[PDB]
Design a protein around this ligand. Structure first.
Ligand SMILES: *[C@@H]1O[C@H](CO)[C@@H](O[C@@H]2O[C@H](CO)[C@@H](O)[C@H](O)[C@H]2NC(C)=O)[C@H](O)[C@H]1NC(C)=O
Ligand SMILES: *[C@@H]1O[C@H](CO)[C@@H](O)[C@H](O)[C@H]1NC(C)=O
Lengths: 13, 179, 187
């Protein structure tokens, strides 16, 4: 099974 | 009171244009993603037999880290990072017996930004036979850690230095070992 | 030439197996945390004024919030599950050796060094005994040291004035061993 990564949120520009 | 911690740690640094994506369990590295080869590197090779990870997800995360960096540099008015120079320790991984194989460990600690140049010196001359190293490891205080390794054969006849360059140091730092 | 660093962590903190779990998604710039999501809070919060624009923007995206509210389950608990076998359960025996710090004649003061190396995990007890009785004073310890390679070491020293006939024992309790290991040094 997969070790999963957490998604990074893009900041407000 | 917590039993364990798993940390997914990543950064992107300008102007070096250099990134990192790694996983940490209780202070040890499970793996990281090599930015050059875009592939998962397990810290012990047996790990690759028990687990998988999609390196492309790490790369997609680094793309956001990069975007977030340009946005946040402008928002802070280009305030540069304060250099914090490392403390360096050298120790062996087992008690030293003359003429029995062993490993010198250079432990570089409590520094930012995550850039170093590290050199092993044997009797003042550089050595690369069998050297390995870790990527930058996270700290609760958000400074960084790093390990460099030198297999060697202890002897009354040699002396060793781990030489660390870092931008928060006015001059290179030598940390010495001899029997 | 100025450096600018963008740093992020996603953290899973585990309590009592996986019964309680705390998830954090944390965003830093040049060593400064400015916005984070804490699973105990349920939304993004500005850690500093520099992260206010992000906490307000992110918190207005409802699918993002529920995405991050599930991480405790589908990221934390999931990842613990698939790595538990070679991390949480990793057990490697310590090697214990005892030796005097300097070669000295008896009835002079000396540091008796107990070297404990190669072991995992990090939690460990090292005690010192003299003729079977536990020495609670005179103990000096380097602390737990990470070797960066999934093994630890530690040096625990005993302040002694050795006299002939005395037995000193370094005793080690670790999760990797059923019986405490003991190494003797004879004066
Ligand atoms: C690591 O080593 C390199 C080379 O010694 C350093 O980079 C050079 O630094 C000089 C001035 O110090 C510049 O004029 C060069 O253009 C740099 N070259 C490159 C390829 O970057 C670097 O500063 C060292 N890193 C640390 C942390 O000391
Ligand atoms: C730990 O979790 C168990 C369930 O496995 C529960 O019964 C117990 O009360 C918990 N212990 C503590 C100290 O919270």
């Amino acid at each position: 099974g997969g070790i999963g990564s957490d998604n990074k949120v893009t900041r407000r520009g | 009171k917590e039993e364990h911690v798993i940390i997914q740690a990543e950064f992107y640094l300008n102007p070096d244009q250099s990134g990192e994506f790694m996983f940490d369990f209780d202070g040890d590295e499970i793996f990281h993603v090599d930015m050059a080869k875009k592939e998962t590197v397990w810290r012990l090779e047996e790990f690759g037999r028990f687990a998988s990870f999609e390196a492309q997800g790490a790369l997609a995360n680094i793309a956001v880290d990069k975007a977030n960096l340009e946005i946040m540099t402008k928002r802070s008015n280009y305030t540069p990072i304060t250099n914090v120079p490392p403390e360096v320790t050298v120790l062996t991984n087992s008690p030293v017996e003359l003429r029995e194989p062993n490993v010198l460990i250079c432990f570089i600690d409590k520094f930012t930004p995550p850039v170093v140049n590290v050199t092993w010196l044997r009797n003042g001359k550089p050595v690369t036979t069998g050297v390995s190293e870790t990527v930058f490891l996270p700290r609760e205080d958000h400074l960084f850690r790093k390990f460099h390794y030198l297999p060697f054969l202890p002897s009354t006849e040699d002396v060793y230095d781990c030489r660390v360059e870092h931008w928060g140091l006015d001059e290179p730092l030598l940390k010495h070992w001899e029997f | 030439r100025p450096r600018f660093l963008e740093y992020s962590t996603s953290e899973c903190h585990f309590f009592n197996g996986t019964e309680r779990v705390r998830y954090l998604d944390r965003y830093f710039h040049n060593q400064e945390e400015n916005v984070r999501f804490d699973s105990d809070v349920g939304e993004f919060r500005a850690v500093t004024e520099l992260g206010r624009p992000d906490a307000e923007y992110w918190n207005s995206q409802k699918d993002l919030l529920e995405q991050k509210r599930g991480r405790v389950d589908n990221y934390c608990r999931h990842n613990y599950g698939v790595v538990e076998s070679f991390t949480v359960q990793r057990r490697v025996h310590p090697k214990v050796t005892v030796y005097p710090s300097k070669t000295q004649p008896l009835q002079h003061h000396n540091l008796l060094v107990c070297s404990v190396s190669g072991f995992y995990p990090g939690s460990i007890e090292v005690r010192w005994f003299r003729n079977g009785q536990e020495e609670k004073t005179g103990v000096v310890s380097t602390g737990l040291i990470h070797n960066g390679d999934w093994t630890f070491q530690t040096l625990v020293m005993l302040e002694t004035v050795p006299r002939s006939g005395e037995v000193y024992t370094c005793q080690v309790e670790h999760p990797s061993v059923t019986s405490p290991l003991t190494v003797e040094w004879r004066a």
